[PDB]
Amino acid sequence: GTGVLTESNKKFLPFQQFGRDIADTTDAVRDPQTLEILDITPCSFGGVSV
Amino acid sequence: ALGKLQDVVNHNAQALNTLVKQLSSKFGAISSVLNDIFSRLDPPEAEVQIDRLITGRLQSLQTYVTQQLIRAAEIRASANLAATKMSECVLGQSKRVDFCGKGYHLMSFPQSAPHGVVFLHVTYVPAQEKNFTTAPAICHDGKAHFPREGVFVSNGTHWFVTQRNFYEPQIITTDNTFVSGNCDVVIGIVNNTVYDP
Amino acid sequence: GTGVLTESNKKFLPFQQFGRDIADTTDAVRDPQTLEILDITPCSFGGVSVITPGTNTSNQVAVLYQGVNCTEVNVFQTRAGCLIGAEYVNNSYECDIPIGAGICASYQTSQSIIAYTMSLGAENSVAYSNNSIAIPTNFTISVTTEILPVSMTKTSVDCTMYICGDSTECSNLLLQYGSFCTQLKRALTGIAVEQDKNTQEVFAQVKQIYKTPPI
Amino acid sequence: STECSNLLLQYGSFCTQLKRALTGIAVEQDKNTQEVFAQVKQIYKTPPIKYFGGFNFSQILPDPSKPSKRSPIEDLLFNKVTRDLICAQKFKGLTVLPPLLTDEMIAQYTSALLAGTITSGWTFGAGPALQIPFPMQMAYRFNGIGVTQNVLYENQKLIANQFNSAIGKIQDSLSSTPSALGKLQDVVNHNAQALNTLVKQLSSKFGAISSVLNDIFSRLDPPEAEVQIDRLITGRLQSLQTYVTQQLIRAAEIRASANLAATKMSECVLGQSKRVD
Amino acid sequence: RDLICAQKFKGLTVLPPLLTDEMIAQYTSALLAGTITSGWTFGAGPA
Amino acid sequence: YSKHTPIIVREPEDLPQGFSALEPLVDLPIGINITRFQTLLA
Numbered sequence: 001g002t003g004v005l006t007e008s009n010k011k012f013l014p015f016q017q018f019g020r021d022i023a024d025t026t027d028a029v030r031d032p033q034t035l036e037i038l039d040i041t042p043c044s045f046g047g048v049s050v
Numbered sequence: 051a052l053g054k055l056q057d058v059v060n061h062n063a064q065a066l067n068t069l070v071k072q073l074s075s076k077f078g079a080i081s082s083v084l085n086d087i088f089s090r091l092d093p094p095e096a097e098v099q100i101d102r103l104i105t106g107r108l109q110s111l112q113t114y115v116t117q118q119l120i121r122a123a124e125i126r127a128s129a130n131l132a133a134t135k136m137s138e139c140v141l142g143q144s145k146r147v148d149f150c151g152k153g154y155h156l157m158s159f160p161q162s163a164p165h166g167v168v169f170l171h172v173t174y175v176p177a178q179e180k181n182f183t184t185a186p187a188i189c190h191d192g193k194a195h196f197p198r199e200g201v202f203v204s205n206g207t208h209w210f211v212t213q214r215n216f217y218e219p220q221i222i223t224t225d226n227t228f229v230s231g232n233c234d235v236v237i238g239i240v241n242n243t244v245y246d247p
Numbered sequence: 248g249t250g251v252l253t254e255s256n257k258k259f260l261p262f263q264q265f266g267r268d269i270a271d272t273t274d275a276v277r278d279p280q281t282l283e284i285l286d287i288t289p290c291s292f293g294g295v296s297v298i299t300p301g302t303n304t305s306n307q308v309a310v311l312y313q314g315v316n317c318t319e320v321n322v323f324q325t326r327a328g329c330l331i332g333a334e335y336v337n338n339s340y341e342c343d344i345p346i347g348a349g350i351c352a353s354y355q356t357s358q359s360i361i362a363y364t365m366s367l368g369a370e371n372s373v374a375y376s377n378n379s380i381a382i383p384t385n386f387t388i389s390v391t392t393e394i395l396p397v398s399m400t401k402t403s404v405d406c407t408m409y410i411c412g413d414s415t416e417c418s419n420l421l422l423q424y425g426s427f428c429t430q431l432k433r434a435l436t437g438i439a440v441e442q443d444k445n446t447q448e449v450f451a452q453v454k455q456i457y458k459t460p461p462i
Numbered sequence: 463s464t465e466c467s468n469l470l471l472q473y474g475s476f477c478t479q480l481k482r483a484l485t486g487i488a489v490e491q492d493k494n495t496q497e498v499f500a501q502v503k504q505i506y507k508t509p510p511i512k513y514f515g516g517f518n519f520s521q522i523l524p525d526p527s528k529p530s531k532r533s534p535i536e537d538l539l540f541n542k543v544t545r546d547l548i549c550a551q552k553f554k555g556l557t558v559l560p561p562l563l564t565d566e567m568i569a570q571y572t573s574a575l576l577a578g579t580i581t582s583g584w585t586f587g588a589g590p591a592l593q594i595p596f597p598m599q600m601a602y603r604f605n606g607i608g609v610t611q612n613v614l615y616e617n618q619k620l621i622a623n624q625f626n627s628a629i630g631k632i633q634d635s636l637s638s639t640p641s642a643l644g645k646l647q648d649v650v651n652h653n654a655q656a657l658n659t660l661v662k663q664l665s666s667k668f669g670a671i672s673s674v675l676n677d678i679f680s681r682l683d684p685p686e687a688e689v690q691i692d693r694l695i696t697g698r699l700q701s702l703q704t705y706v707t708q709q710l711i712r713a714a715e716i717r718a719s720a721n722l723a724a725t726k727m728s729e730c731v732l733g734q735s736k737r738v739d
Numbered sequence: 740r741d742l743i744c745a746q747k748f749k750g751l752t753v754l755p756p757l758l759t760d761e762m763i764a765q766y767t768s769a770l771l772a773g774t775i776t777s778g779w780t781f782g783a784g785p786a
Numbered sequence: 787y788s789k790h791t792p793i794i795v796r797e798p799e800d801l802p803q804g805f806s807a808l809e810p811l812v813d814l815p816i817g818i819n820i821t822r823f824q825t826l827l828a
């Protein structure tokens with residue numbers, strides 16, 4: 001996927017690796033390397049009006 | 051109390067909540083996430099299995115747009131009705147029953163509300179009724195006398211003329227009763243005396 | 248298929264084997280054994296509704312099965328179906344939970360769900376007479392309130408984010424489709440302009456802005 | 463079909479918007495029958511002595527010599543708008559829910575409205591009922607069009623004769639000219655056509671070997687069966703969505719018509735309106 | 740993340756209205772300053 | 787799955803009234819045919 005990967009203050013249990021959101025979209029993930037909790041936020045977007 | 055204002059908000063909220071829950075529903079593919087079919091299949095199968103999701107999402111978006119159009123038509127009808135009530139109840143007294151409140155309309159005050167308006171209608175509600183003996187007209191000096199604007203009532207022993215919406219006993223004078231015809235054609239005419247000033 | 252094989256009184260032709268209905272549904276067949284005319288009616292099916300006074304006073308619920316004569320599932324049989332969980336009281340009150348056929352339900356006192364026919368109001372008889380008039384003697388000016396929606400929220404969608412997510416080949420394949428991503432945005436823009444106009448015709452009806460005096 | 467039942471659940475929760483839309487349409491139709499007829503609080507009854515100045519409503523007032531407490535005009539209008547088709551559609555899924563207000567309750571509401579219009583006049587829609595003779599009631603209704611009351615108080619006989627003649631001519635016209643109750647048959651014919659189109663499309667292939675799901679599940683292989691049954695499971699959902707959209711548009715039209723009818727009953731029956739046409 | 744921001748990250752957005760609550764309040768107060776002080780003359784012609 | 791929860795003294799032996807989720811500990815593979823179960827104590 002794409003987007004910013006910030007540091008999350010969640011409480012991922014040792015058996016919970018991935019994580020979804022209200023719309024069943026991946027919002028947080030566990031690093032395959034040394035265990036760390038991340039937060040996957042979408043890239044900067046918006047709308048333009050002329 | 052504010053039932054018809056929360057209904058449109060709940061509808062607009064569920065229309066958005068149901069539009070995002072259908073993105074996790076596979077329309078005939080092996081996955082729902084976009085970056086899953088383009089990472090396990092070949093282009094000859096990717097261009098076939100990914101279109102089945104794009105078509106479903108387009109159909110869902112079209113259904114949402116149609117629901118929004120119907121909701122906007124309903125909101126436009128409600129807004130036209132609200133503008134008509136604002137222009138006929140607040141900007142003047144209207145003689146339309148139930149259009150500016152239940153009862154005799156007198157005045158209207160508008161107030162704002164989240165995505166809506168609230169009209170406070172002042173209504174004239176009569177009460178404390180009383181029975182009286184009525185008659186179409188009376189006969190004095192051989193000629194009939196019909197009320198100009200009022201109603202003939204009788205406290206049993208005397209006949210008075212009152213208003214049509216409020217009791218106000220007044221003597222029958224030659225100022226609110228006109229003469230038209232003789233006393234042989236109206237059914238129910240009573241006798242009395244019309245006192246002239 | 249499935250169904251209830253019953254005895255019918257249909258006079259089939261000596262060559263006909265199957266049998267359909269007005270609108271594409273098999274309802275009768277010929278027995279491959281000794282000649283007999285049967286009838287295939289669908290199995291016992293129906294809709295289920297739950298009448299609940301809300302999870303704030305109690306948890307007792309009533310179950311209404313639609314399209315049943317209470318012999319195919321207290322127990323009551325109404326024109327809407329079969330109601331189980333309520334009792335038909337011979338009284339009459341205002342409707343609280345509409346069930347159908349003029350029979351509503353409420354939660355009353357032992358606290359339980361009761362069912363009753365709706366009440367169309369009071370029972371007043373005006374004494375008409377050829378010489379009788381009712382003239383009011385006193386006013387009771389009141390103030391009522393009415394609510395009217397004037398505007399709706401203005402939403403906007405996007406194909407590159409809703410149809411496709413964080414991808415590149417999907418956005419390229421979406422361009423091959425028709426103009427389904429420029430007419431929906433135009434419809435949403437029209438809805439937004441209409442919602443912005445509905446407020447200019449209700450609350451904006453005077454040119455000048457008046458102010459109240461201090462005293 | 464169990465495989466189709468599993469595929470429908472795997473297709474997502476799409477069958478939640480249609481049921482909710484149908485429930486909303488049903489609630490709206492139940493509310494439209496109440497915001498029009500159920501406008502008076504108390505239920506009024508006609509007096510026993512039916513001498514209302516000389517006029518004769520023995521055709522609009524409810525007649526006691528009939529089962530469902532209706533009037534001759536209502537009896538003539540009810541018996542005009544027409545395995546059977548209803549049960550066949552019910553066996554397929556198209557089931558009609560019974561309305562909240564029954565015919566007897568609507569008839570009682572209409573009778574109470576007539577009683578309030580005759581005995582009270584135009585005061586029962588703005589507050590308490592006020593007794594008033596019908597001759598004086600019609601004499602006070604002339605002052606809103608310019609004609610004074612001395613015309614009625616002198617030609618009450620001719621007015622009553624013309625009213626009794628027009629009441630009979632109403633029934634005479636309703637008994638003929640079949641193109642009269644057309645707007646009431648229009649919605650019924652539209653609903654029948656919609657229910658027929660929604661049930662006929664079940665035998666129309668959206669692209670498949672046949673229309674029977676059992677033949678597809680049997681006389682085929684799973685890799686091709688899962689593709690052939692999808693073309694039929696996608697067409698039926700689109701047809702049902704189109705039906706729901708048509709029902710929503712028709713319900714909006716009927717809601718506008720019901721609002722117009724309520725406005726008319728509140729401005730024409732509950733009082734004299736000075737609006738042309 | 741709340742529901743308002745979760746729907747934003749999916750494409751669905753909510754445009755802000757044109758007339759703020761302050762302007763609607765001023766409009767409603769302007770109609771009361773003409774209905775109470777004046778009568779039905781501030782809607783037909785001069786106040 | 788497993789979960790330790792306070793089972794503080796109560797009425798005669800019975801399953802207490804209280805919600806408690808069960809998180810998984812191990813996910814060992816297996817391919818057996820299990821249709822019965824026998825317990826064992828010390």
Ligand SMILES: *[C@@H]1O[C@H](CO)[C@@H](O)[C@H](O)[C@H]1NC(C)=O
Nearest residue numbers: 017030031032033034035036
């Ligand atoms: C190896 O992978 C494990 C996975 O949990 C991680 O914790 C550890 O830090 C990794 N070590 C190295 C050498 O990257």
Ligand SMILES: *[C@@H]1O[C@H](CO)[C@@H](O)[C@H](O)[C@H]1NC(C)=O
Nearest residue numbers: 178179180181182372374381
């Ligand atoms: C008028 O008389 C009728 C019949 O007796 C009665 O029901 C009604 O209350 C009376 N109204 C008044 C206020 O005198």
Ligand SMILES: *[C@@H]1O[C@H](CO)[C@@H](O)[C@H](O)[C@H]1NC(C)=O
Nearest residue numbers: 204205206207208209210219
């Ligand atoms: C009726 O009104 C007349 C007015 O002169 C009054 O003298 C009389 O006492 C009244 N009688 C009753 C019954 O109110």
Ligand SMILES: *[C@@H]1O[C@H](CO)[C@@H](O)[C@H](O)[C@H]1NC(C)=O
Nearest residue numbers: 189192233238239240241242
């Ligand atoms: C009114 O007076 C005339 C003349 O005296 C009489 O013929 C008639 O019967 C009277 N009618 C009433 C209402 O008393």
Ligand SMILES: *[C@@H]1O[C@H](CO)[C@@H](O)[C@H](O)[C@H]1NC(C)=O
Nearest residue numbers: 264277278279280281282283
């Ligand atoms: C089958 O055999 C039975 C024997 O009694 C007979 O009654 C029946 O008519 C036969 N049906 C056919 C299909 O020949």
Ligand SMILES: *[C@@H]1O[C@H](CO)[C@@H](O)[C@H](O)[C@H]1NC(C)=O
Nearest residue numbers: 176177178384385386387388
């Ligand atoms: C008239 O009705 C009002 C209702 O509030 C009451 O306060 C007042 O005392 C009544 N006065 C008369 C004329 O009886």
Ligand SMILES: *[C@@H]1O[C@H](CO)[C@@H](O)[C@H](O)[C@H]1NC(C)=O
Nearest residue numbers: 375376377378510511512513
């Ligand atoms: C007055 O009302 C009664 C009610 O029964 C009616 O019979 C009579 O014809 C009417 N006309 C008269 C005599 O006032």
Ligand SMILES: *[C@@H]1O[C@H](CO)[C@@H](O)[C@H](O)[C@H]1NC(C)=O
Nearest residue numbers: 512517518519520521626630
């Ligand atoms: C009213 O009109 C009907 C028309 O059939 C007639 O039968 C009835 O006798 C009339 N009643 C009166 C009192 O005129």
Ligand SMILES: *[C@@H]1O[C@H](CO)[C@@H](O)[C@H](O)[C@H]1NC(C)=O
Nearest residue numbers: 816817818819820821822823
């Ligand atoms: C598993 O055990 C059951 C016990 O009845 C047996 O019938 C079955 O053949 C065995 N094999 C599997 C894995 O189903």
